[PDB]
Amino acid sequence: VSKLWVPNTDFDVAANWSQNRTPCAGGAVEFPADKMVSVLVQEGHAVSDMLLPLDGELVLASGAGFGVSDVGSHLDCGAGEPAVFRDSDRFSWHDPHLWRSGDEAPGLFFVDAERVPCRHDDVFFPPSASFRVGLGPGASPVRVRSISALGRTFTRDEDLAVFLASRAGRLRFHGPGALSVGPEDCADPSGCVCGNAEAQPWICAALLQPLGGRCPQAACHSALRPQGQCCDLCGAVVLLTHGPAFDLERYRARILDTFLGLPQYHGLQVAVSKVPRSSRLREADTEIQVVLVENGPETGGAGRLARALLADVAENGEALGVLEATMRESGAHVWGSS
Amino acid sequence: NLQQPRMATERGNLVFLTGSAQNIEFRTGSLGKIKLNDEDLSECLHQIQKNKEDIIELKGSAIGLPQNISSQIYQLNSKLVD
Amino acid sequence: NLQQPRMATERGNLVFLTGSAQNIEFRTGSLGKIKLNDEDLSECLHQIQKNKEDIIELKGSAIGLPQNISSQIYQLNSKLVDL
Amino acid sequence: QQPRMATERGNLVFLTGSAQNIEFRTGSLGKIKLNDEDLSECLHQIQKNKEDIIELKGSAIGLPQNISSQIYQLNSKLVDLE
């Protein structure tokens, strides 16, 4: 299970410039002086003036170039208010939408706390783009299985601490949080908890930061909040008591291939993972949480699929390794302003 | 209060600028060269040292003695005509 | 663009190309230095100028030498023989 | 291993990989200026010093065996005459 970093600090990407205005031919460029950043350049740019960071680097890949500003096709860019590089400290490790999972499949989604890297995940920062990531305040030491960056794969804390302290690491990793690696594998067929329960307040604070930190209300009464999810949603949650024979990967493929392929379950999305059996503040037990969400204007497809899952357990629970299966569901859909 | 390094267009020329006490350095790997039109700069700058050493030898030869051989011979041609 | 001063890459190499009748200039502050790998530019230029001035005085001394020096030694000892 | 324009405390470093080069290339009338000093003029001055030294060595050849000793036969017979 690989987690890939989505954003970048590339020069030729409009979103990285102040209010999405990329530098135009023959114009002025400014990187904020005190911002430490590594920027990958891949295209040619005619520049009249460019202020570099006090501590940083512009990497010149194949195709990269900087030339003087002429006047012919430069008249447009002219004297129009320099392009400024956006704050390159704005990317948080605990932001769910900055990570992409290698297990993504049709009809499958993941709760918010499992969208950031988990304990047994392999983290990849793509070398095709420069990056910078911050480990937020508090944010108890992130520990993953491995971190790949700059063509290297760190599996030992000794190698990682050397790189993170070096100038190459400090150009790309900042923040007070601690980062570590440990090569252990899960090896439990019933799964492993993501391990981000203690960091969930920081994961949700990063996710809800564009919204002032407040969850938007779900469009249903008695909305559910599954384990690892930041805000309420509409749908159903099935909790399985797993026996020693439960194969979490096979059971997840069972829902995706056997049930979601049926016509009466079209347009439904499922999230399957082992979660703590409790939000209990003190060292609780585990369960298999199945989150069922129906997007679009449909019936209780989530509740109907939830009942089909309980029926499949009542019929094949012994062979599937499920000892007990409960469920809960959200209420009626609200059509106005909540 | 440190001045930002700057790349600018100036009278049609590409210009790189640093602050009061900030350097501009060109650094290659252990097997790389710095060239100006196929000429290796490191060998030209080493020629400065070779030129310095050959001048030291020339200063110690018949040319250079802060009273020239021409000066000494001039003195005895002087004294013997006298 | 491609005819005017520019900085580009070529198979891993960093290339500064001035083009015709234009310059690529690197300027530091009053107290800054320019380093060409391990060589200091200003330190090199000072030695170039010193070598140039030393060559000028060595060249003027070589020209000022009489072409008679060997004849002058025998001249001096044909008079010492006379003495 | 890619070329980069790195900065540290306002210092500007053009850094190149292990076996890569930093190559200045000029056209007709094009110049590379390092703190207002023409790089090509400096390389030519090194070469002119190299060639002026070669000729100065040639003018040092053909000089007497070593006139330094022949200096102490000048004053030796000046002391004789007095």
Numbering used by the authors:
A (entry chain A): 20 to 357
B (entry chain D): 38 to 119
C (entry chain C): 38 to 120
D (entry chain B): 40 to 121
What does the article say, verbatim?
The intestinal uptake of B12 is a complex process that requires binding to the carrier protein ‘intrinsic factor’ (IF) and uptake of IF-B12 by the intestinal cubam receptor. Cubilin has been suggested to form trimers, which are anchored to the apical membrane via interaction with the type-1 transmembrane protein amnionless (AMN). AMN is formed by an extracellular domain, a transmembrane helix and a short cytoplasmic domain harbouring two adaptor protein-2-binding signals (Phe-X-Asn-Pro-X-Phe) for ligand-independent internalisation in clathrin-coated pits. As cubilin and AMN depend on each other for proper processing and translocation to the apical membrane, disrupted interaction of the two proteins leads to retention of both in the endoplasmic reticulum (ER).
For structural analysis, the ectodomain of AMN (20–357) and an N-terminal fragment of cubilin (26–135) were co-expressed in Escherichia coli. Crystals of the AMN(20–357)–cubilin(26–135) complex were obtained and the structure determined to 2.3 Å resolution by the single anomalous diffraction method. Electron density is observed for the entire ectodomain of AMN and for cubilin residues 37–120. The structure reveals a receptor architecture, where three cubilin chains combine into an intertwined β-helical structure that docks on to a corresponding β-helix domain in AMN. AMN forms a bean-shaped structure protruding ~60 Å from the plasma membrane and is composed of four structural entities. The fold of the two N-terminal domains of AMN (denoted β-helix 1 and β-helix 2) is similar and is formed by right-handed β-helices with hydrophobic cores. The head is formed by a three-turn intertwined β-helix, which irreversibly interlocks three cubilin chains. In the C-terminal region three cubilin chains form a coiled-coil, which is interrupted midway owing to the presence of a proline residue (Pro103). The cubilin interface with AMN is formed by the N-terminal strands of three cubilin chains (residues 42–49), which combine into a triangular face with a hydrophobic centre formed by Met44.
